[PDB]
Scaffold this active site. Structure first.
Site, PDB file in Angstrom:
ATOM      1  N   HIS B 136       0.834  -1.187   0.000  1.00  7.27           N
ATOM      2  CA  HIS B 136       0.000   0.000   0.000  1.00  7.27           C
ATOM      3  C   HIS B 136       0.870   1.238   0.000  1.00  7.27           C
ATOM      4  O   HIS B 136       0.788   2.097   0.874  1.00  7.27           O
ATOM      5  CB  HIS B 136      -0.915  -0.048   1.226  1.00  7.27           C
ATOM      6  CG  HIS B 136      -1.941   1.036   1.275  1.00  7.27           C
ATOM      7  ND1 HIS B 136      -2.881   1.115   2.280  1.00  7.27           N
ATOM      8  CD2 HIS B 136      -2.169   2.093   0.459  1.00  7.27           C
ATOM      9  CE1 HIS B 136      -3.644   2.176   2.081  1.00  7.27           C
ATOM     10  NE2 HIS B 136      -3.232   2.786   0.984  1.00  7.27           N
ATOM     11  N   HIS B 138       2.488   4.716  -1.664  1.00 10.74           N
ATOM     12  CA  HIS B 138       2.210   5.889  -2.472  1.00 10.74           C
ATOM     13  C   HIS B 138       3.535   6.371  -2.998  1.00 10.74           C
ATOM     14  O   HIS B 138       4.359   6.851  -2.228  1.00 10.74           O
ATOM     15  CB  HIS B 138       1.578   6.993  -1.615  1.00 10.74           C
ATOM     16  CG  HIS B 138       0.144   6.749  -1.248  1.00 10.74           C
ATOM     17  ND1 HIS B 138      -0.909   7.309  -1.942  1.00 10.74           N
ATOM     18  CD2 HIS B 138      -0.410   6.032  -0.241  1.00 10.74           C
ATOM     19  CE1 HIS B 138      -2.048   6.952  -1.376  1.00 10.74           C
ATOM     20  NE2 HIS B 138      -1.773   6.176  -0.342  1.00 10.74           N
ATOM     21  N   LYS B 219      -6.173   0.064  -8.969  1.00 18.73           N
ATOM     22  CA  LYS B 219      -6.518   0.635  -7.694  1.00 18.73           C
ATOM     23  C   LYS B 219      -7.620   1.617  -7.824  1.00 18.73           C
ATOM     24  O   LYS B 219      -7.476   2.638  -8.495  1.00 18.73           O
ATOM     25  CB  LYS B 219      -5.422   1.332  -6.927  1.00 18.73           C
ATOM     26  CG  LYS B 219      -6.085   1.887  -5.679  1.00 18.73           C
ATOM     27  CD  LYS B 219      -5.201   2.632  -4.752  1.00 18.73           C
ATOM     28  CE  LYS B 219      -5.866   2.788  -3.412  1.00 18.73           C
ATOM     29  NZ  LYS B 219      -4.966   3.308  -2.414  1.00 18.73           N
ATOM     30  N   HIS B 221      -9.802   4.343  -6.116  1.00 16.78           N
ATOM     31  CA  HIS B 221      -9.711   5.210  -4.951  1.00 16.78           C
ATOM     32  C   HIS B 221     -10.713   6.335  -4.930  1.00 16.78           C
ATOM     33  O   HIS B 221     -11.061   6.911  -5.960  1.00 16.78           O
ATOM     34  CB  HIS B 221      -8.303   5.780  -4.821  1.00 16.78           C
ATOM     35  CG  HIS B 221      -8.116   6.631  -3.607  1.00 16.78           C
ATOM     36  ND1 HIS B 221      -8.814   7.802  -3.404  1.00 16.78           N
ATOM     37  CD2 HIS B 221      -7.316   6.479  -2.527  1.00 16.78           C
ATOM     38  CE1 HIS B 221      -8.451   8.336  -2.251  1.00 16.78           C
ATOM     39  NE2 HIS B 221      -7.542   7.552  -1.700  1.00 16.78           N
ATOM     40  N   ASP B 223     -10.739   9.537  -4.024  1.00 14.19           N
ATOM     41  CA  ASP B 223     -10.425  10.797  -4.674  1.00 14.19           C
ATOM     42  C   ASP B 223     -10.585  10.777  -6.168  1.00 14.19           C
ATOM     43  O   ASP B 223     -10.765  11.822  -6.798  1.00 14.19           O
ATOM     44  CB  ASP B 223      -9.028  11.245  -4.267  1.00 14.19           C
ATOM     45  CG  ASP B 223      -8.984  11.717  -2.817  1.00 14.19           C
ATOM     46  OD1 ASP B 223      -9.525  10.995  -1.942  1.00 14.19           O
ATOM     47  OD2 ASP B 223      -8.420  12.806  -2.558  1.00 14.19           O
ATOM     48  N   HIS B 248     -10.190   1.621  -2.182  1.00 17.87           N
ATOM     49  CA  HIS B 248     -10.419   2.599  -1.128  1.00 17.87           C
ATOM     50  C   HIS B 248     -11.871   2.997  -1.208  1.00 17.87           C
ATOM     51  O   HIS B 248     -12.291   3.729  -2.110  1.00 17.87           O
ATOM     52  CB  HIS B 248      -9.538   3.822  -1.338  1.00 17.87           C
ATOM     53  CG  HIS B 248      -9.676   4.854  -0.264  1.00 17.87           C
ATOM     54  ND1 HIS B 248      -8.721   5.042   0.712  1.00 17.87           N
ATOM     55  CD2 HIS B 248     -10.641   5.778  -0.032  1.00 17.87           C
ATOM     56  CE1 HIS B 248      -9.089   6.042   1.495  1.00 17.87           C
ATOM     57  NE2 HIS B 248     -10.251   6.506   1.065  1.00 17.87           N
ATOM     58  N   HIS B 274      -6.531  -0.459   4.347  1.00 14.35           N
ATOM     59  CA  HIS B 274      -7.040   0.103   5.594  1.00 14.35           C
ATOM     60  C   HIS B 274      -8.511  -0.184   5.791  1.00 14.35           C
ATOM     61  O   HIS B 274      -9.336   0.723   5.900  1.00 14.35           O
ATOM     62  CB  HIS B 274      -6.790   1.621   5.648  1.00 14.35           C
ATOM     63  CG  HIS B 274      -7.251   2.361   4.430  1.00 14.35           C
ATOM     64  ND1 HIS B 274      -8.530   2.243   3.926  1.00 14.35           N
ATOM     65  CD2 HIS B 274      -6.603   3.225   3.612  1.00 14.35           C
ATOM     66  CE1 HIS B 274      -8.649   3.000   2.850  1.00 14.35           C
ATOM     67  NE2 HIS B 274      -7.494   3.606   2.638  1.00 14.35           N
ATOM     68  N   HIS B 322      -8.063  17.302   3.849  1.00 15.91           N
ATOM     69  CA  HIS B 322      -9.488  17.498   3.586  1.00 15.91           C
ATOM     70  C   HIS B 322      -9.969  18.931   3.768  1.00 15.91           C
ATOM     71  O   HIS B 322     -11.059  19.281   3.315  1.00 15.91           O
ATOM     72  CB  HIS B 322     -10.317  16.557   4.471  1.00 15.91           C
ATOM     73  CG  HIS B 322     -10.023  15.105   4.250  1.00 15.91           C
ATOM     74  ND1 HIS B 322     -10.404  14.433   3.108  1.00 15.91           N
ATOM     75  CD2 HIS B 322      -9.354  14.205   5.009  1.00 15.91           C
ATOM     76  CE1 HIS B 322      -9.983  13.181   3.174  1.00 15.91           C
ATOM     77  NE2 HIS B 322      -9.343  13.017   4.317  1.00 15.91           N
ATOM     78  N   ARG B 338     -15.679   9.336  10.408  1.00 15.88           N
ATOM     79  CA  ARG B 338     -14.551   8.638   9.797  1.00 15.88           C
ATOM     80  C   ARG B 338     -13.504   8.154  10.791  1.00 15.88           C
ATOM     81  O   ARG B 338     -13.009   7.032  10.670  1.00 15.88           O
ATOM     82  CB  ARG B 338     -13.894   9.533   8.735  1.00 15.88           C
ATOM     83  CG  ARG B 338     -12.657   8.928   8.075  1.00 15.88           C
ATOM     84  CD  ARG B 338     -12.276   9.671   6.800  1.00 15.88           C
ATOM     85  NE  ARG B 338     -10.906   9.377   6.389  1.00 15.88           N
ATOM     86  CZ  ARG B 338     -10.354   9.797   5.255  1.00 15.88           C
ATOM     87  NH1 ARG B 338     -11.056  10.531   4.400  1.00 15.88           N
ATOM     88  NH2 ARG B 338      -9.091   9.501   4.985  1.00 15.88           N
ATOM     89  N   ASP B 362       0.973   2.802   3.727  1.00 14.13           N
ATOM     90  CA  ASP B 362       0.230   3.949   3.218  1.00 14.13           C
ATOM     91  C   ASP B 362       1.129   5.173   3.260  1.00 14.13           C
ATOM     92  O   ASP B 362       0.705   6.293   3.549  1.00 14.13           O
ATOM     93  CB  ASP B 362      -1.021   4.179   4.069  1.00 14.13           C
ATOM     94  CG  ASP B 362      -1.967   5.185   3.463  1.00 14.13           C
ATOM     95  OD1 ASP B 362      -2.854   5.680   4.192  1.00 14.13           O
ATOM     96  OD2 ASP B 362      -1.834   5.472   2.260  1.00 14.13           O
TER      97      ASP B 362
HETATM   98 NI    NI Z   1      -6.372   5.070   1.141  1.00 12.28          NI
HETATM   99 NI    NI Z   2      -3.407   5.085   0.542  1.00 14.92          NI
END
Ligand code: NI
Ligand code: NI
Lengths: 238, 569, 79
Positions: B136, B138, B219, B221, B223, B248, B274, B322, B338, B362
């Site tokens: 995971h 990035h 993936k 996600h 976003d 995600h 996650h 955010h 959350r 992550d």
């Molecule tokens: Ni994520």
């Molecule tokens: Ni992530």
């Protein structure tokens, strides 16, 4: 005399039978090979004569040799002697089941099992289900077939058998004569419980949600017992 | 056949059968289950030791002669915890057993023969495990690699294009061009690599092209828009190319709830990142997914383990991110819908139960790519301290539980991404990605990292000194990290499709390139020591977690092991 | 009433709905070619009055609250 390769096969077998007999004549305990050839050569001629029917030779072959004519072990060995010959109605397959008898000790490759019972499908708690064959034709289900998708004829609680199979010895099956009604045992499918194929009722991960889809499908497909459509809520893919 | 005491023996060859080792400063005690050596014939390298011409080292080796032997190593792997020599040949683990010279010693398979061509590595007193596999990641900054590496991780799977917002938010390397950039960039590093593509698309053509381009999977996600459409489309193409898919969940529940997302997945395989929720996902019952059969549950680094500070910390990250405000109610709501302290604490326990299976990081986005291993063990330590030993545990040890966690960052991530055949566990035939741990520092700071059968990174001292021990002693790049050697030692993963299309020659890739396989026929039941399925509910009101009827939760902690004890920062 | 429309708000923002909450939202029509693909797979084509029929029918069977009703649908040759 355009002799086929099949013909030569038999012509050779015959003289293997002839030898077989000539040896017994001289009074000698025949063996596996000799006994078989003999029985084979015999049936062959009889079909040639056009007298004895296929059905009759099946038996008459069981009287070509007695337990004292062969060597010990031969009996336990010759489980059966299949053979083809040309009858006036053409070639037919004659199977002489157990031609001689076990008048002795010696038994080649004999098995020495150990009295005890193998417990199948360890820890897979079965469940009984009422099943009836409402159709006019027979229906036999295999040991590892997703029960939930058998012939749409077998009526029963489909809902209850989702993701299950007949809790029986691997490879066997349960028969249902038209009209017949029985209660079958069925454990849950092992492995990843990935049901693909069969009647195309699942084709995915077998879970409670796939179930909804399965019943809905069977419903529209006419599988007796397939619960009902108490207003379905179609998913984004099915 | 004179005999010797156990205390002695162990200072020469290390712990043998029945003996126990404490893992780092934790309460986790491991016990040597078996020993392949032959007391009296064990291998030792040194001044007057056993590994020498005509003796342990053969003058008539087998035509399989090893390139490297790790002597008397204690192997900790999901396959067991035992004592044995490790043989290494052609970048692969060639043998696990006795080994030595058949010319002078009984019982020595030829796949373990020691000849003038084999090098010696002392392992007595040390513990050997496979390299870790963080799935995971990035690809925000290349500096992460040497960090994850120093921590015992030899394989990173994720997505991205560097410090770009898309990457900071998601683990995705979008489009074949950006896939190219990254594959070609990867040549530079010491770490096996694999990339995930943008599954956030309902365009089948665009979906497969990224795989044909080199991606090991997709993936989806938030976003980018984790919708049931994108989800559905991605999965289908994923099935064709036998490649994996990570996801995600839709936190905002805009498209639907976790119920819908599942219906979308249609029972197909999935790697859930996650799964807990803090890292993101359906509010607030996403964590329930981790109990389904078709799911590959994975937890994200940050909320692990559950410490008295984790709740406060997160609220901050979620706010710093955010763009949330304290005075705005909708903003305080999202934050509370959350960062459920309930589902967080319920996590630590889910891992202990085998409910969760994989531990990620992550990195650079609510994750610490350097503490996956450290934290996986901290959690295990806590759970023992709070729940005690395990029922499955056999004997006076923690072996079983040990394997439970190890698998979480080795064999389980490896399977989840079709690279289990080459890496992911200390087994014969696999690439030799091994990391030597010094029992005291276990789970925190490793001795040396061997990549692809050769030493790539190790603790090193004053390069001017008369030995490698004197300070400073930090992690220095070794030979398998330089020149053309790195290329032989590393692997960039790709799909069968690309591999077959010649993606290697295509991009001038000098690295060993393998393809991922068997990603579509795996389920929660393929996760080693973490195959527990279950119908888990989640209270909408109290955000409380319930499993199989009962409810699970863990108590936070004020102190954790493998922490302040070992690092100056 | 909201077919082919989106929340008339600053680009990038959103509207929250707490369980139970009830509000009235503003929503303008989608610009560009009005080509709706993805989302819940309810449209996946040109957004017009006809596609609409199909959208409602779909949502209907999928359980989307408010998705009018099935006053006897006349399935087209492709949908
Ligand atoms: Ni994520
Ligand atoms: Ni992530």
């Amino acid at each position: 005399m355009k002799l086929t390769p099949k013909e030569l096969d038999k012509l050779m077998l015959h003289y293997a039978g002839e030898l077989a007999k000539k040896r017994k004549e001289k009074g000698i305990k025949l063996n596996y090979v000799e006994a078989v050839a003999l029985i084979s050569a015999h049936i062959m001629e009889e079909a040639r004569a056009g007298k004895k029917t296929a059905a009759e030779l099946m038996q008459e072959g069981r009287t070509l040799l007695k337990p004292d004519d062969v060597m010990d072990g031969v009996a336990s060995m010759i489980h059966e002697v299949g053979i083809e010959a040309m009858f006036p109605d053409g070639t037919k397959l004659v199977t002489v089941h157990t031609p001689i008898e076990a008048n002795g000790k010696l038994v080649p490759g004999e098995l020495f099992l150990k009295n005890e019972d193998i417990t199948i499908n360890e820890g897979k708690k079965a469940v009984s289900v009422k099943v009836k064959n409402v159709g006019d034709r027979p229906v036999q289900i295999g040991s590892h077939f997703h029960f939930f998708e058998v012939n749409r004829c077998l009526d029963f609680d489909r809902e209850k058998t989702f993701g299950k199979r007949l809790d029986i010895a691997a490879g066997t099956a349960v028969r249902f004569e038209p009209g017949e009604e029985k209660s079958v045992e069925l454990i849950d499918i092992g492995g990843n419980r990935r049901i693909f194929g069969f009647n195309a009722l699942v084709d995915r991960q077998a879970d409670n949600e796939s179930k909804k889809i399965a019943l809905h499908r069977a419903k529209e497909r006419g599988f007796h017992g397939a619960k009902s459509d108490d207003n379905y809520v179609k998913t984004i893919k099915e | 056949m004179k005999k010797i005491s156990r205390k002695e023996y162990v200072s020469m060859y290390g712990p043998t059968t029945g003996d126990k080792v404490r893992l780092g400063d934790t309460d986790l005690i491991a016990e040597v289950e078996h020993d392949y050596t032959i007391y009296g014939e064990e291998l030792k390298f040194g001044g007057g030791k056993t590994l020498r011409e005509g003796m342990s080292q053969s003058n008539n080796p087998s035509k399989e002669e090893l390139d490297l032997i790790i002597t008397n190593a204690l192997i900790v792997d999901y396959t067991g915890i035992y004592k044995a020599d490790i043989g290494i040949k052609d970048g692969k683990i060639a043998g696990i057993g006795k080994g030595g010279n058949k010319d002078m010693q009984d019982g020595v398979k030829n796949n373990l023969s020691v000849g003038p061509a084999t090098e010696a590595l002392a392992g007595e007193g040390l513990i050997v495990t496979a390299g870790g596999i963080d799935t995971h990641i990035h690809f925000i900054s290349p500096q992460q690699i040497p960090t994850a590496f120093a921590s015992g991780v030899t394989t990173m799977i994720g997505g991205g294009t560097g410090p770009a917002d898309g990457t900071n938010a998601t683990t995705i390397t979008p489009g074949r061009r950006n896939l190219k950039w990254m594959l070609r960039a990867a040549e530079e590093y010491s770490m096996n690599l694999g990339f995930l593509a943008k599954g956030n698309a309902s365009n089948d053509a665009s979906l497969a092209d990224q795989i044909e381009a080199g991606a090991i999977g997709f993936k989806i996600h938030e976003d980018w828009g984790t919708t049931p459409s994108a989800i559905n489309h991605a999965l289908d193409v994923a099935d064709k190319y036998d490649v994996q898919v990570a996801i995600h969940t839709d936190t905002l529940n805009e498209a639907g709830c976790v119920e819908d997302t599942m219906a979308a997945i249609a029972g197909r395989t999935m790697h859930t990142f996650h799964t807990e929720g803090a890292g993101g996902g359906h509010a607030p019952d996403i964590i329930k997914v981790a109990g389904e059969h078709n799911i590959l549950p994975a937890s994200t680094n940050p909320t692990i383990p559950f410490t008295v500070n984790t709740e406060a910390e997160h609220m901050d990250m979620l706010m710093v991110c955010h763009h949330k405000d304290k005075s705005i109610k909708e903003d305080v709501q999202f934050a509370d819908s959350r960062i459920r302290p309930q589902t967080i604490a319920a996590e630590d326990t889910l891992h202990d139960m085998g409910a969760f299976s994989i531990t990620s990081s992550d990195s650079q986005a609510m994750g610490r790519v350097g503490e996956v291993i450290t934290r996986t063990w901290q959690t295990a330590d806590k759970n023992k301290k709070e729940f005690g030993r395990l029922k499955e545990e056999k004997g006076d040890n923690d072996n079983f539980r040990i394997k439970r966690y190890l698998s979480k960052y080795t064999i389980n991530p490896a399977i989840a991404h079709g690279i289990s055949e080459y890496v992911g566990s200390v087994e014969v035939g696999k690439v030799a990605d091994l990391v030597l741990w010094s029992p005291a520092f276990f789970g925190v700071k490793p001795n040396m990292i061997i990549k692809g059968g050769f030493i790539a990174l190790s603790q090193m001292g004053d390069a001017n000194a008369s030995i490698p021990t004197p300070q400073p002693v930090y992690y220095r790049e070794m030979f398998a990290h330089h020149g053309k050697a790195k290329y032989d030692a590393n692997i960039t993963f790709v799909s069968q499709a690309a591999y077959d299309k010649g993606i290697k020659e295509e991009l001038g890739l000098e690295r060993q390139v393998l393809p991922v396989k068997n990603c579509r026929n795996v389920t929660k039941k393929d996760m080693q020591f973490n195959n527990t399925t279950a119908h888990i509910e989640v209270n909408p009101e109290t955000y409380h977690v319930f499993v199989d009827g009962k409810e699970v939760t863990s108590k936070p902690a004020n102190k954790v092991s493998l922490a302040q004890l070992f690092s100056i920062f």
